[PDB]
């Protein structure tokens, strides 16, 4: 029905495919950051996951914040003591963009345990907006996933939650996921979820829609599968905790498959 905008679905998917290339962060940015590392970014993204749980923000909001941060850090050097300010301001902007009821600025100041002032948060907000030139309508893994989900026969809630979980895990690790576009991560996550739960594969209908095959998705899939297999041991655990909740069908408790048989 009109909730899946049949007359526009394909125009939208095309347009998002075009924009994810323009909103892509620079793949080698961390190497050009003197003071920060992939591991500090992972700490930060894991903290944003907790903040989104504390305020019951949309997952889309989280994905947008991470995109904003990664684009900002692609052109702005940041000291480690200020990384969280960038992250706080990113989450504020994403909330304002995406949420019906965003938390107030004071709640963002509060959650940084008063490391930062309200003035600093609002000043960083303005700097992020200028650095990103207000281009906040970025495509996310989620926006692709939700369209891929329409191709399931029938829809399966475990598959959907699992795919979101896998996509969310990818946010944490810049190495390697920065080299992959949201549409590709979404595809690999959808395939991997579909396989884990039902034994099925990336369907022909999504080959038609995306132009992607298991062969073109292989590299991302192999990374994602390793990430999935190693997830209990990763230093960052907020996504796994989050996806134990019934809201997400407890999918983080499902066992990854040992092999992909590709």
């Amino acid at each position: 029905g009109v909730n899946e905008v049949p007359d526009y679905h394909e125009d939208i998917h095309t347009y998002l495919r075009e924009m994810e290339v323009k909103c892509k962060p620079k793949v080698g940015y961390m190497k050009k950051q003197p003071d920060i590392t992939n591991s500090m970014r992972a700490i930060l993204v894991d903290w944003l996951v907790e903040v989104g749980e504390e305020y019951k923000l949309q997952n889309e909001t989280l994905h947008l914040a991470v995109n904003y941060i990664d684009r900002f850090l692609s052109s702005m050097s940041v000291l480690r003591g200020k990384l969280q300010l960038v992250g706080t301001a990113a989450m504020l902007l994403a909330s304002k963009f995406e949420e019906i009821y965003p938390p107030e600025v004071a709640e963002f100041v509060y959650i940084t345990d008063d490391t930062y002032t309200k003035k600093q948060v609002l000043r960083m907000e303005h700097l992020v907006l200028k650095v990103l030139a207000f281009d906040l309508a970025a495509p996310t893994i989620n926006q692709f996933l939700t369209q891929y989900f329409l191709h399931q026969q029938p829809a399966n809630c475990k598959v959907e939650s699992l795919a979101m979980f896998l996509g969310e895990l990818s946010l944490i690790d810049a190495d390697p996921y920065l080299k992959y576009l949201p549409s590709v991560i979404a595809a690999a996550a959808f395939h991997l979820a579909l396989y884990t739960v039902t034994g099925q594969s990336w369907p022909e209908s999504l080959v038609q829609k995306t132009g992607y095959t298991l062969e073109t998705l292989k590299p991302c899939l192999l990374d994602l599968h390793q990430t999935y297999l190693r997830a209990p041991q990763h230093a960052q655990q907020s996504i796994r905790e989050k996806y134990k909740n019934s809201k997400y069908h407890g999918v983080s408790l499902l066992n990854p498959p040992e092999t992909l048989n590709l």
């Binding site: 029905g1 009109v2 125009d11 889309e60 963009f97 948060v121 303005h126 907006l129």
Partner: protein, 300 residues
């Protein structure tokens, strides 16, 4: 981008609202006439309406969508520089009392509004406030969607978004009836109301409250049941106690409208958001078979 701000010469105030003054101004170097919307900054930082307006209009480049030219982004003020347009459709309707708007102009304007809207929808943007005051016309015959402060980037399939939304007279029944989800069809409902309004110069459903608005729609189009709109009786704010009004001939709803016009209007005002016509499909309606783009018949 284009600087600026010392390059602009304010000519006069043209509008207000939030946050929220609009001036007419002229670029002193290029001669370009612009509309400057000033947004005062501060204790919650940059307002979310502005964040949406700007981010979404950066993506939307189209002849029938108001062009955002620049954003002048200072510590305490934010100016949005838009292309200048001469009048809003509402003031044009009022100026056209006595004659009415010639059909070629109504047809032209509807065709352009539908192009603008199809473009929004194709770029995953819901406008959510289409009304004559937000539609701007120039002296060359263009009409453009404007005021994107209520707009939103949507996902496919849609999630639950802000319930408010849409000025009451132009608000679709699935919003009035509290549906969990609404989509691109809400904008089409609004343009249907606007189509009718261009023909009559008076609002089609001028409700004074949500229930009154629903009841005015029901009295014109019939109180919807499960045949006309499967699911309606299960909607959150549907009440079995709602009066059951008979659907009128549509010829009686907008008497001066021809058969093609009526057909298109009835498809834009279909109760079932699933069956309501898209902007994309409306562009191909036989109503538009002879469409042109004349200038407005009146001085702007």
């Amino acid at each position: 981008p284009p600087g600026s701000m010392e390059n602009f010469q304010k000519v006069e105030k043209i509008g207000e609202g939030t946050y929220g003054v609009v001036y007419k101004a002229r670029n002193k170097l290029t001669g370009e006439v612009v509309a400057l919307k000033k947004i005062r900054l501060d204790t919650e930082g940059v307002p979310s309406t502005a964040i949406r307006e700007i981010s979404l209009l950066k993506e939307l480049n189209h002849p029938n969508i108001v062009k955002l030219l620049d954003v002048i982004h200072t510590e305490n003020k934010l100016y949005l520089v838009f292309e200048f347009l001469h009048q809003d459709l509402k003031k044009f309707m009022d100026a056209s009392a006595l004659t009415g708007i010639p059909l070629p102009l109504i047809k032209s304007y509807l065709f352009q509004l539908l192009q603008g809207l199809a473009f929004c929808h194709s770029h995953r943007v819901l406008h959510r406030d289409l009304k004559p005051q937000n539609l701007l016309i120039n002296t060359e015959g263009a009409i453009k969607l404007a005021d994107f402060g209520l707009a939103r980037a949507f996902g496919v399939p849609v999630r639950t978004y802000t319930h408010e939304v849409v000025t009451l007279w132009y608000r679709a029944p699935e919003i009035l009836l509290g549906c969990k989800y609404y989509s691109t069809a809400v904008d089409i409902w609004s343009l249907g109301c606007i189509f009718a309004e261009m023909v009559t110069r008076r609002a089609l459903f001028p409700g004074d409250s949500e229930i009154d608005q629903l009841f005015r729609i029901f009295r014109t189009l019939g109180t919807p049941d499960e045949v006309v709109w499967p699911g309606v009786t299960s909607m959150p704010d549907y009440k079995p106690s709602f009066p059951k009004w008979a659907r009128q001939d549509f010829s009686k709803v907008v008497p001066p409208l021809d058969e093609d016009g009526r057909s298109l209007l009835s498809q834009m005002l279909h109760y079932d958001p699933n069956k309501r016509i898209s902007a994309k499909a409306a562009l191909a309606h036989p109503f538009f078979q002879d469409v042109t783009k004349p200038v407005p018949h009146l001085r702007l």
